[PDB]
């Protein structure tokens, strides 16, 4: 097989299911986990494998691109510019269920309208933003209003806002033509780029906040998850969620298989061996919190 077919075969067949007991009480050691993580192909696409004229101006990083087979394609809601391109992919969820998430980069000022078009067209009711709030200049623009802003054809209004530990919940309305929809926005502020949170507790409370969020669209749509490049922290968050789901439903988790499936959907999901190790930590904590009960 080609390098491409070797990559795809690994991502479709690799696996290391651990019982809850193994995860909690006799986990793979850190050296083993690092070696395991480093074996997983990135599945990045190269600029040459994309034939989408004009996409480069919509990418935050030229080497981090949406795999074409799962990319989110925009409709024709904007008249300011042509193109169906956004740096975002559909991500399968538990048991390979289609379009449970969309993983996307942090919007830049020129892709904010694109972002909200995606949210509208995909019937999104929940956005999960992962960042580290620091003081000073911001890498990524605030694409949501303090009160009310218009972005292309979309009017966004803050309905209510509340603070929890390590995350802010915003309740938004998005208006397109004569239509309004509610969107919940969660901004998790304690995840530095290329690193992990200090503790897994807040991350598990974020996952709980996600689980408890109602669907508010006419049809179920993907949960949007984003962070600056849309691969490291998005990959960690989604893997955590799916991992918790496996542990709750089955009393076991295949973390390797979860991460392989994410990589089939978007190249580079989960960036570092430390993040992969922290994922095992986070799921072990979750296992200890499961009801007795």
Swiss-Prot record:
Tissue and organ expression note: Expressed exclusively in thymus and spleen.
PTM-bearing positions, type Phosphoserine: 29, 46, 79
Keyword Cell wall biogenesis/degradation belongs to the record: no
Gene Ontology CC terms, in alphabetical order: cytoplasm; cytoplasmic side of plasma membrane; cytosol; microtubule cytoskeleton; mitotic spindle; nucleoplasm
PTM comment: Phosphorylated on serine residues in resting T-cells. Phosphorylation increases upon exposure to stimuli that increase intracellular cAMP levels. Phosphorylation leads to dissociation of bound MAP kinases.
Catalytic activity entry: O-phospho-L-tyrosyl-[protein] + H2O = L-tyrosyl-[protein] + phosphate
Keyword Transit peptide in annotation: no
Modified residues (Phosphothreonine): 2
Subunit and interaction comment: Monomer. Interacts with MAPK1, MAPK3 and several other MAP kinases.
Entry protein name: Tyrosine-protein phosphatase non-receptor type 7
Organism: Homo sapiens (Human)
Gene: PTPN7
Full-protein interval shown: 65 to 357 of 360
